[PDB]
């Protein structure tokens, strides 16, 4: 499995990828991922049990989630690998990512409805079932009201942070994990969710297929941070209440630890790192 920059995919690779997403949607398997992710979005709190988000396990959790997702896609089409979206470079609504032969464009002004591409509600192929409001159609407001995606210099400022994470292991932390996630500082991951808008900015964000490409790039940035700081380990390393330590298992799988997920190369490689 080789995860490529989305900007480098061929027309053929895009077709196979979107056909696999549409089949995974029809099977019901797609919505199971949305349900699981929504469960952790609602469940994870700063003061309580925190696993998928606002916690040191944000990174290995999403790594494992994406591996699961990509294995489900490969059961539809074994040639497919999740691509990544370098939003520092492909940073406008005019990027090839948002063409009709890939993810389709932004939402129309009236109701935010996506009107083109494979995921537009008019296709009948992308009913939004796992929802927080009555709307059954994919919505986006790409860069709405002049929102800007992070720059390369802003990404580099977070990659320079050598400490993986810090007590109190939540939205208040300094260190790489929380600055990458974006609850403190220049704000990388959170701000990108907001920039896409529509469901991607909500607690059912995996309804937008771009969710996977954003998280594949966040995952790649974790790999790049490890290359910059090879001696920086995952922390914490034991006995932290409500937090997944290095050698503890993560819900929902209960059979994998952060330690088992630090090296991505057992599962996939990148076109380039």
């Amino acid at each position: 499995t080789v995860r490529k920059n989305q900007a480098t995919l061929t027309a053929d690779e895009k077709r196979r990828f979107v056909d696999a997403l549409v089949a995974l949607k029809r099977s019901g398997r797609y919505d199971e991922f949305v349900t699981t992710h929504n469960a952790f979005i609602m469940g994870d709190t700063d003061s309580g049990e925190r696993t998928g988000h606002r916690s040191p396990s944000f990174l290995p959790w999403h790594r494992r989630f994406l591996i699961e997702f990509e294995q489900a896609l490969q059961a539809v089409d074994p040639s497919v690998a999740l691509p990544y979206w370098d939003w520092s470079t492909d940073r406008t609504a005019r990027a090839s990512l948002w063409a009709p032969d890939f993810l389709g464009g932004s939402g129309r002004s009236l109701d935010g409805r996506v009107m083109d591409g494979p995921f537009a509600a008019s296709t009948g192929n992308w009913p939004v079932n796992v929802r927080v409001d009555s709307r059954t159609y994919l919505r986006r407001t790409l860069g709405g009201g002049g929102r800007e995606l992070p720059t390369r210099a802003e990404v580099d400022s977070v990659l320079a942070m050598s400490t993986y994470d810090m007590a109190p292991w939540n939205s208040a932390s300094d260190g790489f994990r929380n600055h990458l996630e974006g609850w403190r500082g220049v704000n990388l991951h959170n701000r990108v969710h907001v920039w896409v808008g529509g469901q991607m900015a909500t607690g059912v964000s995996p309804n937008d297929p771009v969710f996977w490409l954003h998280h594949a790039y966040i995952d790649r940035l974790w790999a790049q941070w490890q290359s910059r700081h090879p001696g920086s380990g995952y922390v914490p390393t034991g006995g932290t209440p409500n937090v997944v330590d290095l050698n503890e298992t993560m819900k929902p799988w209960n059979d994998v630890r952060p330690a088992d997920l630090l090296d991505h190369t057992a599962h996939y490689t990148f076109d380039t790192v």
Binding site: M42, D111, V132, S134, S171
Partner: protein, 72 residues
């Protein structure tokens, strides 16, 4: 702690009800949460903290564009 409110904002009734504190839009509960810095998010605007539950309810009204909430 969080201040109760009850008002119409862009054609939606938004409430913060104290018992337990809950935010409601047209009588349906908006799941909200407070970050340890005192800021608030909701399931309609999860990644963009604002200062107060009233601000969270108003952000949700803008996002919903007239749509009702469903149960969570």
């Amino acid at each position: 702690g969080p201040q109760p409110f009850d008002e119409v904002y862009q054609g939606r009734r938004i409430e913060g009800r104290a018992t337990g504190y809950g935010v409601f839009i047209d009588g349906m509960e908006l799941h909200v949460m407070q970050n340890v810095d005192g800021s608030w998010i909701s399931v309609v605007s999860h990644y963009d903290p604002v200062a107060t539950p009233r601000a969270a309810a108003r952000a949700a009204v803008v996002e919903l564009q007239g749509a009702p909430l469903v149960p969570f």
